[PDB]
């Protein structure tokens, strides 16, 4: 009887902090995003009613969590093996790929940026063997990447961390592009507790 009413507010509390996380993520305020992430992670264990609306946002939160820590190779979300958080965002984007029922036309353009980021970040951290592994296992070998696909290995062979290709890559615009992509496939409905807090403090 009371289990649903707990599940009801649990969805509410979960969807409120998912909104504040994107809003903090959009403003490049990853400290509060990381704090809010831990709150949502603590809600994962709680009874959340099986609603497809929250499963979609949890996967979006999964991807953005791995991107925010994508420059920190001293941690791994898929801990069973050792996968850089950007390799982690690749598999999550592939789980977002199937469950969100997307045509690959809209997805593959974003999967370019993540696989590109997964290799470049490994280059800037001087783990050159790691970069080429992601480079062969995930990079497309299609024409659009063929210019950059050939560009990266040459740098990894030369250990040329000063190549413009590596230093023109800005991680901030990479995250923000991944945000509006993942966010465009969710609806901007205002969370119920945010509306209900607006009425009280007025």
């Amino acid at each position: 009887g009371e289990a649903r009413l707990e599940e009801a507010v649990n969805r509410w509390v979960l969807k409120f902090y998912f909104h504040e996380a994107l809003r903090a993520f959009r403003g490049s305020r990853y400290g509060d995003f990381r704090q809010i992430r831990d709150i949502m992670q603590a809600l994962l264990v709680r009874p959340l009613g099986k609603e497809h609306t929250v499963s979609r946002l949890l996967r979006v939160m999964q991807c953005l969590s791995r991107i925010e820590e994508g420059e920190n190779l001293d941690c791994s979300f898929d801990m069973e093996a050792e996968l850089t958080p950007l390799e982690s965002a690749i598999n999550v984007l592939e789980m977002i790929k199937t469950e969100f029922t997307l045509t690959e036309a809209v997805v593959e353009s974003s999967r370019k940026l993540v696989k590109e980021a997964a290799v470049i970040i490994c280059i800037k951290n001087k783990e050159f063997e790691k970069a080429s592994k992601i480079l062969k296992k995930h990079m497309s070998k299609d024409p659009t990447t063929q210019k950059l696909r050939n560009d990266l290995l040459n740098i990894i062979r030369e250990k040329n961390l000063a190549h413009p290709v590596i230093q023109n890559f800005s991680y901030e615009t990479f995250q923000q592009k991944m945000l509006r992509f993942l966010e465009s496939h969710l609806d901007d409905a205002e969370p119920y507790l945010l509306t209900m807090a607006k009425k009280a403090l007025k």
């Binding site: 949502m40 994962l44 959340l48 949890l58 939160m61 001293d74 941690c75 791994s76």
Partner: peptide, 12 residues
């Protein structure tokens, strides 16, 4: 849903 939608990393 504890590692099903894992949001937090694990420091190596």
């Amino acid at each position: 849903r504890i590692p099903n939608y894992q949001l937090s990393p694990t420091k190596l």
